[PDB]
Design an enzyme around this catalytic site. Structure first.
Site, PDB file in Angstrom:
ATOM      1  N   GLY B  53       0.732  -1.211   0.054  1.00 58.92           N
ATOM      2  CA  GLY B  53      -0.001   0.063   0.088  1.00 58.92           C
ATOM      3  C   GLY B  53       0.645   1.413  -0.060  1.00 58.92           C
ATOM      4  O   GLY B  53       0.229   2.342   0.055  1.00 58.92           O
ATOM      5  N   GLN B  54       2.201   1.333   0.310  1.00 60.61           N
ATOM      6  CA  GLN B  54       2.894   2.439   0.129  1.00 60.61           C
ATOM      7  C   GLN B  54       2.782   2.980  -1.353  1.00 60.61           C
ATOM      8  O   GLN B  54       2.504   2.365  -2.317  1.00 60.61           O
TER       9      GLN B  54
END
Lengths: 91, 159, 135
Positions: B53-54
Site C-alpha cells: 500500500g505505500q
C-alpha cells in the site's frame, strides 16, 4: 511468430495462463512483433502482472527486454509515473 | 476464487494474509511488491494477491485488477487522519472497469485498539452505502486474533 | 551509440529478430536487413562490406545472415569481436541459424543483444553469463 501483425488477442490469452512457459512465449511473441514494428499496447496489464517482483530471471529478463525498445509508447498497464511498472518492483 | 487485497500501507494486509495461511501472526516488513498465496476455506481455494500500500506500489495495483472476482479493502480503524485518503483511493477503484462486477469486502481492522473507529463509522466515512452496482459488505476484524477473518471469507464465498 | 543495431537476419527479406538498444531503429531495422543481407550484405564473401552508407558486418549461416551494423566505428578489431561473441551465443539459443527456430527464441537472442552491446558500445558475453538472465 516471424512477423504477424494481428495476433494481439491471442497473446493476451497466452500471457497469463497459469503456465510460466506460455507467459514467456507470449511476452517473446510481443517482442518479435514490435521489433519488426507491429501492434503491442493492448496487452500491457496482462504482460506486467505475473513478472513484477520476482527474482525468477527469465520473465523478468523478458520484461526488462521490452523496456528499451517501446516503454514510452505502451501505456494500458503502465500509464505515466515516476516509479512506473517498468521500475517500482524492479528496485 | 480470485481475490485482490489492497488498502493503505500499515492497514494490516499481510498480517491478514499470513494469519489466514499459517494460522500465525508474523513480523511483517512493508511490502514493496505483492504477496500471493492460496488459502483453503470450506471447499473454496482463494488466491489472494496482497499488494503493498505505500505510494510507489499503490500506483501499480491496476495491473492486478483484471480477473479479480473479489476485492478485500483493508482499513486501519485506528488511523483517522488517513480515512479520507482511503475513501479517495477506494472510490476511484470502484470506477475501474476491470473491477466492475467484483465483490467488495471492507475489513475495518485493528478493531482491537481502544480508539478504533467502529465499522459503522467507517462505513459512513468510506461512503459504502452509496454502492448500488455490486455486492459489498463491511466486517470488523482483528488480524492478530483472527477475529472477523473467516466471516469475511464466508461472505466472499457467497458472492 | 556507434552501433545502430545488432541484428539476426533471414534473407527471406526480413529481419527475423533484432535489437534496437534505444528507440531509433524500429521498422528501419527490418528494411535494412531485408534488402542488404539478401545479396550477402552485397558482399563477395568478405566480412566487411558497406552499402547505402551503413557498414554491415556479417557471417552467412544457411539462408540467414547474422549481421552487425554500424555507421561509425571506433576500432577494427572490436566490430568483429562483438559479432564473434554473438556467434558463440546464437547456436546455444537456436542450433545454428534458421528462421523458425530464430523466431521462437526472439527473447533469448534479444536479451543477449542488449547484454552484448549496450547503448551501441560493445560489451562482452559468454554462454555461462547468459544463463543467470534466462534462469
Amino acid at each position: 511468430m516471424d512477423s504477424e501483425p494481428p495476433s494481439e488477442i491471442s497473446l493476451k490469452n497466452d500471457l497469463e495462463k497459469g503456465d510460466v512457459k506460455s507467459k514467456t512465449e507470449a511476452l517473446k511473441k510481443v517482442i518479435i512483433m514490435i521489433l519488426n514494428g507491429e501492434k503491442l499496447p493492448g496487452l500491457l496489464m496482462t504482460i506486467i502482472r505475473f513478472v513484477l517482483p520476482l527474482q525468477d530471471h527469465t520473465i523478468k529478463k523478458l520484461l526488462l527486454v521490452f523496456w528499451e525498445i517501446v516503454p514510452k509508447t505502451t501505456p494500458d498497464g503502465r500509464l505515466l509515473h515516476e516509479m512506473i511498472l517498468v521500475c517500482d518492483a524492479y528496485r | 476464487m480470485r481475490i485482490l487485497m489492497v488498502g493503505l500501507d500499515g492497514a494490516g494486509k499481510t498480517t491478514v494474509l499470513y494469519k489466514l495461511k499459517l494460522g500465525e501472526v508474523i513480523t511483517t516488513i512493508p511490502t514493496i511488491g505483492f504477496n500471493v498465496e492460496t488459502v483453503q476455506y470450506k471447499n473454496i481455494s482463494f488466491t489472494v494477491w496482497d499488494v503493498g500500500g505505500q505510494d510507489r506500489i499503490r500506483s501499480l495495483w491496476r495491473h492486478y485488477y483484471r480477473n479479480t472476482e473479489g476485492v478485500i479493502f483493508v482499513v486501519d480503524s485506528n488511523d483517522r487522519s488517513r480515512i479520507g485518503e482511503a475513501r479517495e483511493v477506494m472510490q476511484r477503484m470502484l470506477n475501474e472497469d476491470e473491477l466492475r462486477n467484483a465483490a467488495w469486502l471492507v475489513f475495518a481492522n485493528k478493531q482491537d485498539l481502544p480508539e478504533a473507529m467502529s465499522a459503522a463509522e467507517i462505513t459512513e466515512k468510506l461512503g459504502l452505502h452509496s454502492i448500488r452496482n455490486r455486492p459489498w459488505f463491511i466486517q470488523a476484524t482483528c488480524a492478530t486474533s483472527g477475529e472477523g477473518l473467516y466471516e469475511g471469507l464466508e461472505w466472499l464465498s457467497n458472492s | 551509440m556507434v552501433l545502430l543495431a545488432a541484428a539476426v537476419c533471414t534473407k527471406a527479406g526480413k529481419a527475423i529478430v533484432s535489437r534496437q538498444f534505444v528507440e531509433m531503429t524500429r521498422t528501419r531495422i527490418e528494411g535494412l536487413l531485408a534488402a542488404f543481407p539478401k545479396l550477402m550484405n552485397t558482399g563477395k564473401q568478405h566480412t566487411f562490406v558497406e552499402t547505402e552508407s551503413v557498414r554491415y558486418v556479417y557471417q552467412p549461416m544457411e539462408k540467414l545472415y547474422m549481421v552487425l551494423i554500424t555507421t561509425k566505428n571506433s576500432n577494427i578489431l572490436e566490430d568483429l569481436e562483438t559479432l564473434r561473441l554473438f556467434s558463440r551465443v546464437i547456436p546455444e539459443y537456436c542450433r545454428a541459424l534458421e528462421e523458425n527456430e530464430i523466431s521462437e527464441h526472439c527473447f533469448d537472442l534479444i536479451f543477449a543483444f542488449d547484454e552484448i552491446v549496450a547503448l551501441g558500445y560493445r560489451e562482452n558475453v559468454n554462454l555461462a553469463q547468459i544463463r543467470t538472465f534466462t534462469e
